[PDB]
Amino acid sequence: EIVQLLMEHEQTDITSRDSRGNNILHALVTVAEDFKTQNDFVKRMYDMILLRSGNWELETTRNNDGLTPLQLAAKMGKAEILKYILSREIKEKRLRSLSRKFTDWAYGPVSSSLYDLTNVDTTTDNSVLEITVYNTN
Amino acid sequence: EIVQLLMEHEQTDITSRDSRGNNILHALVTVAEDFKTQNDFVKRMYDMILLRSGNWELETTRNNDGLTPLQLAAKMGKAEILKYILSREIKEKRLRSLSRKFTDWAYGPVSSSLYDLTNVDTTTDNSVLEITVYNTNIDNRHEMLTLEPLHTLLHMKWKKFAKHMFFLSFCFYFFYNITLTLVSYYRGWLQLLGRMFVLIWAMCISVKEGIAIFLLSDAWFHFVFFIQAVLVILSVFLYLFAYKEYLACLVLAMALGWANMLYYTRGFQSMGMYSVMIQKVILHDVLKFLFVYIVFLLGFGVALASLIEKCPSSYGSFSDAVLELFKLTIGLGDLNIQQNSKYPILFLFLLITYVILTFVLLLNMLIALMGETVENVSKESERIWRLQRARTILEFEKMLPEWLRSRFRMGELCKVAEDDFRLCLRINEVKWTEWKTHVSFLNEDPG
Amino acid sequence: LVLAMALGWANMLYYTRGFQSMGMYSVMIQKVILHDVLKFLFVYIVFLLGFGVALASLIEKCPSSYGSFSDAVLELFKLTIGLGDLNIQQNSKYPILFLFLLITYVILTFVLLLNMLIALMGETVENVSKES
């Protein structure tokens, strides 16, 4: 409720980066320890804030370590939130652009989804598939 | 309800001690067998009576055995009630002084509680940490040392002083045993440097072991360290004495020392449970196999000594025949076609029956083992290791000088209530499950 | 050259990791040789080097079956396999202690082999498979 109140005001800067460089989404990635520990409330807030502000900027921005929050979720050992980020199906047609999983072929029980490999398929500097494999910590 | 009625009357004496010396709380400690047996109603009554009479007297008083009900809960094997007594958070500000766990630093999901180490931190005559460790009659100490303050006290004492003392003692023993081997393998100017230290350290171990052996599967090793030093000092006496029987006790002391160095593998994190496995299995599973194997040895020995003595020979007297059978179970004794024997077919049949019975007996020790390993063995190993470490930590805790223990002095004096002024232990924790606006807190600025 | 050979035939185990079924097998080799066996090996070496100086102290009375230290350690390692023929104590000061000390070596080696098997049985059920 308080998060909705703070998003309602025009004075609020959603995209504000802190001293460490993290916007709000990087922080939510920082905190999301585990399902049994937290009960996955962070995933809900990650959904709600993006659906509140329809943009790619928040995922676009980087902390001082130079990482998008997808790449931060991969660098840290955050799995339950990555399963959400890496496959999003937004139903609303106005904010449907922000989805990363698209169904294009559904006829019935058979359907083929369509994932986004933008920062994932090792075609960039450090993709998710590179980080999650080459990270020993 | 009736307990409330009886507390309502002014004629009631809450603090009345019975013939045995127990007030009401000692009694409730006496009865509290287990959770599944009782459903933990005793804990509720322990709470209700203290909240009815706000005092420290009831916990202060002692039975004729001279024990506070905390110490009584520790002496008896009462765990579920001790987890309650040892960490109480009373919310009421008027009776908040009677709590033993205080939260002083809560900001959000992160918070550090603050336990009371008054009668717990081995700074008194017999603390809880002393009783629960040195009491053998409990048979439930696995669940006693995992409680909130005690577990961390053991970790802290290990991190501060017991690790270094243990490693240092291991080092001295290692140097000692190597000097013993360097003396015995080459058997004078180097002996003047070595043997003096050897005799001094042998006398030291023997004195310590004879001192602590009079006050007592936990004491076995400590019984062996004495026998080793006895053998060493005996061999050093018989070195100056003119005899040949000194080397025997010397090398037996050697082999016993290299067998005793298994003791110090118990302090390691990973290798400790391994040595505990050695101990438990050699104590229980193998000793059943060994006697029932010896009886077959001594039966078939007289059997074969009865047959093959017909023409005085491969299998000679009894001792040689038993030795040949023991050569056989390994594969060393070459099977000889029966010669100088009355009846060779019975000879061979009786021997093959020995082979088969030994094989199925080895098989069954393996079987009982497989059955043992799955659940009980692992839990038993972990429990024994934790208990052993706890025993060692408190053994070294009493070796230190008087000023050294006061120098370490785990805990800090916190300001609680108007003037609690009690030694406390700080433990930081993180709780994401329950969200509660923090009403009861001691310090406002979280440091 | 020959050490490089043997090391190459030991390194070809690396490429068994790409196979579907044989891969988890080599991972089992690695995990067990790393964790379960290495505990057994040092605690076996220490008995070797204790009983070696012991037997070299006894059987050196008349310079001989068990000679210098290296030969005695070698004979003990012959014994744990079954290769070293057990000799009745000769050229020895005291044969009964000789035989007793050797049988104690046999029994301690046996129970130690037993315990590595035990910790192994405990390891295999759930954690080992998932780890592999």
Residue numbers in the entry:
A (entry chain B): 276 to 412
B (entry chain A): 276 to 462, 480 to 508, 518 to 613, 620 to 754
C (entry chain B): 551 to 613, 620 to 688
The article reads:
TRPV3 is most abundantly expressed in epidermal and hair follicle keratinocytes where it plays a key role in the maintenance of normal skin physiology. In contrast to other thermoTRP channels, TRPV3 sensitizes, rather than desensitizes, upon repeated stimulation with either heat or agonists. The TRPV3 channel, like other thermoTRPV channels (TRPV1, TRPV2, and TRPV427–30), is a fourfold symmetric homotetramer.
We determined the structure of full-length, human TRPV3T96A, hereafter simply referred to as TRPV3, in the closed apo state to ~3.4 Å using cryo-electron microscopy (cryo-EM). Characterization of both T96A and wild-type channels confirmed that the T96A mutation did not significantly alter the ligand-dependent gating profile of the TRPV3 channel. Indeed, apo TRPV3 possesses a π-helix in the S4−S5 linker, whereas S6 is fully α-helical. In the apo structure, where the S6 helix is entirely α-helical, two pairs of interactions are present between S6 and the S4−S5 linker: one between residue N671 in S6 and the backbone carbonyl of Y575 located in the S4−S5 linker, and the other between the hydroxyl group of Y575 and the backbone amide of M672 within S6. Together, these interactions between S6 and the S4−S5 linker stabilize a straight, α-helical conformation of S6. Second, the selectivity filter (SF, residues 636–640) of TRPV3 is lined with backbone carbonyls, whereas the SFs of TRPV1 and TRPV2 are occluded by hydrophobic amino acid side-chains, such as methionine. Similarly to the SF in TRPV4, the TRPV3 SF is sufficiently wide (~7 Å) to permeate a semi-hydrated calcium ion. First, the high quality of the TRPV3 EM density map has allowed us to build the most complete thermoTRPV CTD to date (residues 707–754), a region that was not well resolved in the cryo-EM structures of TRPV1, TRPV2, or TRPV426–30. Notably, a thorough reanalysis of the apo TRPV3 datasets yielded no evidence of structural species containing symmetries lower than C4.
